[PDB]
């Protein structure tokens, strides 16, 4: 009864930046020996779990996220590094008991022109909390009269598209990052790694 990980990594369609899909899975047997022994990733920074010592501890739920960013944004998704995408699309707490994992997929999302559904959140009139998603198409008002239309007066659509073509630099290629989130709730551990 192995835990289903094919739907998270070996998927076909991935989500967007502003709406990161969750993949809560439990009541399984999660073999972690397929993550750290697979030469197909770029970052494997497990924060405070000692990835070698994961096949003995048991947890309760494993939350698997999945979204698409560019090369110069993979290092921004980590505790201790902020920038453009730090408080607009995704913000991680400063405990991160999971393992940030990413790989460069430049053969499925790098067509001529590219898919225009990858919309990163631009300047927002708010802040961001750990594990907080916000799917909103409201035009950003910088302080003037609200347009309440389609770029009426000083309005900007906050879902700026990405330019993904098979001719850009490595720092602008479509990446795919999966960030697991382990936890320990007040319940018997139903998922382990024997």
């Amino acid at each position, epitope marked *: 009864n192995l835990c289903p990980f094919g739907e998270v990594f070996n998927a076909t369609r991935f989500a967007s930046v502003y709406a990161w899909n969750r993949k809560r899975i439990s009541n399984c047997v999660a073999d972690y020996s397929v993550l*750290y*022994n*697979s*030469a197909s*990733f*770029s*970052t*494997f*920074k497990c924060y*405070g779990v*000692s*990835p*070698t010592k994961l096949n003995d501890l048991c947890f309760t739920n494993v939350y698997a996220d999945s979204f698409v960013i560019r090369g110069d944004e*993979v*290092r921004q998704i*980590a505790p*201790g*590094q902020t920038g453009k995408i730090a408080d607009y699309n995704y913000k991680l707490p400063d405990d991160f008991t999971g393992c940030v994992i990413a790989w*460069n997929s430049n053969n499925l999302d790098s067509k001529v022109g590219g898919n225009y559904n990858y919309l990163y959140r631009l300047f927002r009139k708010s802040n961001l909390k750990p594990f907080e998603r916000d799917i909103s198409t409201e035009i950003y008002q910088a302080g003037s009269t609200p347009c309440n239309g389609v770029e009426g007066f000083n309005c900007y659509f906050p879902l700026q598209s990405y330019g993904f073509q098979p001719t850009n630099g*490595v720092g602008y290629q479509p990446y795919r990052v999966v960030v697991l989130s382990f936890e320990l709730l007040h319940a018997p551990a139903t998922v382990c790694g024997p």
Partner: antibody, heavy 119, light 112 residues
Framework: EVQLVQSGGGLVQPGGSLRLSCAAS????????MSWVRQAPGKGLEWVAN????????YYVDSVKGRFTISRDNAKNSLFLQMNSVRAEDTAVYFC????????????WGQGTLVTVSS | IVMTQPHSVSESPGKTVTISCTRSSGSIASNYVQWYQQRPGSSPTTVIYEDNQRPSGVPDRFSGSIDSSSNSASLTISGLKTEDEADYYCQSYDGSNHNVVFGGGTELTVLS
């Protein structure tokens, strides 16, 4: 417990191939990645290659792409690095190291064999 | 892609010595950084891994760090003695071309 022995040290001329061996003893030879690292005399270490759990996926450094081949066999518990087209920059003391996990350190090392191409 | 280190260093016993491992290009927080200690002639051995945990048997006078500011990671060697005068290398898997990059090399010497 873990102990590695190397054999095949000698002296050849540019063009002559060699064979280096590394036999493991004390664990499972089908559960850890293997790698090779040479050390130029007085200089720093140099990565060479890394083999998969069976031998399917292999990656070599661009400096010796093609003229270097790493291989392993679970039925003998011995590592092999057979290469060809040896040139001047292949003068170093090769080692033998196993990998705990791919994105991890090299736990154990070997004694070392001097292989030079002196004229 | 390459890792840079100071050529050598010297200090009197009694305090801590530092060794620089500066990333040339790319992020330094990509994968784990592991240091090695090699006595002249002997076989290299792991002195630290993941920059936080320590291998079993290594003395408690070794606790490195990672500075995510300028892509660097220094080693903190406390309790400097004459029995630690050797070479120290850093190592960190970095790059999408599946290549391991070792360190430059640092010849740590003591006041003798």
């Amino acid at each position: 417990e873990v102990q590695l022995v190397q054999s095949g040290g000698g002296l050849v001329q540019p063009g002559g191939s060699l064979r280096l061996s590394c036999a493991a003893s004390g664990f499972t030879f089908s559960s850890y990645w293997m790698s090779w690292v040479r050390q130029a005399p007085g200089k720093g270490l140099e990565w060479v290659a890394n083999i998969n759990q069976d031998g399917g996926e292999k990656y070599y450094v661009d400096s010796v792409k093609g003229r270097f081949t790493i291989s392993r066999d679970n039925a003998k518990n011995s590592l092999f690095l057979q290469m060809n087209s040896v040139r001047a920059e292949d003068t170093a003391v090769y080692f033998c190291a196993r990998v705990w996990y791919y994105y991890g350190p090299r736990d154990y090392w070997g004694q070392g064999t001097l292989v030079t191409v002196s004229s | 892609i390459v890792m840079t280190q100071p050529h050598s260093v010297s200090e009197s016993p009694g305090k801590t010595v530092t060794i620089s491992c500066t990333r040339s290009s790319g992020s330094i927080a990509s994968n784990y950084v592991q240091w090695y200690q090699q006595r002249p002639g002997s076989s290299p051995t792991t002195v630290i891994y993941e920059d936080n945990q320590r291998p079993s048997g290594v003395p408690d006078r070794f606790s490195g760090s990672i500075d995510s500011s300028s892509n660097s990671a220094s080693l903190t060697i406390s309790g400097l003695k004459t029995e630690d005068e050797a070479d120290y290398y850093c190592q960190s898997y970095d790059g999408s071309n599946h290549n391991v990059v070792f360190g430059g090399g640092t010849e740590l010497t003591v006041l003798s």
